[PDB]
Write a protein that binds this ligand. Structure first.
Ligand SMILES: [Sr+2]
Length: 119
RNA sequence: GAAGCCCUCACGGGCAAUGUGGUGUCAGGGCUACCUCUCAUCAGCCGACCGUCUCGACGAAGUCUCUUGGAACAGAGCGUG
């Protein structure tokens, strides 16, 4: 909420999670705020997800600005456990990063595009 | 970066991407590229001597004479470990 600066429509979040699921099956994805953080720093990240029900918020507060000064596009998910399920985890995930999609590159592109428009 | 931990005989359950586990800890470390090599460390297995304290077993040689005395464990004489 303090790091969130725009609401994402359930529909968009839907497409993003699906795109993320086919990303792990095909391409490569990072699970965890730390791994997600290094990817954004090493530049090996295409799309990073960030849960919105993260408490404490400090764990993810840095993702937004870090992503901006790195061109890396990012999107919010209303729930932490979905992101983890989608990321293929048996647990939750405060943040996620698609380290190069996989037969989803097309979708990822649009989502990023759609997001930028959503400001 | 799930390669992990806990409970249960098992089935199964719980924990864990807000990081279990690997690596590492100033002879700094890590990574990339090399040489060599380990007996350092950490973990676990086995597992005492001796010594000290206490307890216990075993363990030599007179119960001879006279006198005094209620009593010899005394005096005098002979004898022993
Ligand atoms: Sr959780």
């Amino acid at each position: 909420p303090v790091y969130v600066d725009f609401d994402v429509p359930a529909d968009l979040e839907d497409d993003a999670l699906e795109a993320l699921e086919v990303a792990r099956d095909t391409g490569a994805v990072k699970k965890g705020t730390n791994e997600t953080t290094k990817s954004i720093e090493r530049g090996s990240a295409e799309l990073v997800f960030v849960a919105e029900d993260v408490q404490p918020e400090e764990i993810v507060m840095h993702i937004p600005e870090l992503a901006d000064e790195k061109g890396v596009p990012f999107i919010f998910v209303e729930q932490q456990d979905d992101l983890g399920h989608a990321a293929g985890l048996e647990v939750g995930s405060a943040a996620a990063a698609v380290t190069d999609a996989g037969e989803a590159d097309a979708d990822v592109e649009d989502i990023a595009d759609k997001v930028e428009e959503l400001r």
